[PDB]
Amino acid sequence: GITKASLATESFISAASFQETTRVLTEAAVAGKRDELRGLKENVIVGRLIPAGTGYAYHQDRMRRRAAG
Amino acid sequence: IETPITANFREGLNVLQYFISTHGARKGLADTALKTANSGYLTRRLVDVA
């Protein structure tokens, strides 16, 4: 279901937004979970360009520059 | 109610007819004002999912 599918997210910065923050931060901290951003919500939170829109050019360009030469 | 309002707005409604219309009115306002919130919640769930 939608409310359940929303629960699944890789980015913990995103999860800490609409989910229970107190639990998300712990549950992520133990696993040493490393958030790569990628998605929208996290990028809005951190205050950098949206990886959609006009931003797609940037993020893509960077995303490919990453994990590369 | 098995006794419908036999009068309309152009003619005058009387005390009973109006008093009986009142409940429908308030339920209308309350319901819509609530469905605003429900709609909002739905959009929220939706954008969170996508």
């Binding site: 279901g1 939608i2 409310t3 359940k4 | 469905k35 429900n38 709609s39 739905l42 769930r45 939706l46």
Partner: peptide, 22 residues
Amino acid sequence: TGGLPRVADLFEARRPKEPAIL
């Protein structure tokens, strides 16, 4: 039933109250 709750129920995938079986 119907209405906006019906939509919510659909998107939530919720099993109805008195369902059939296939």
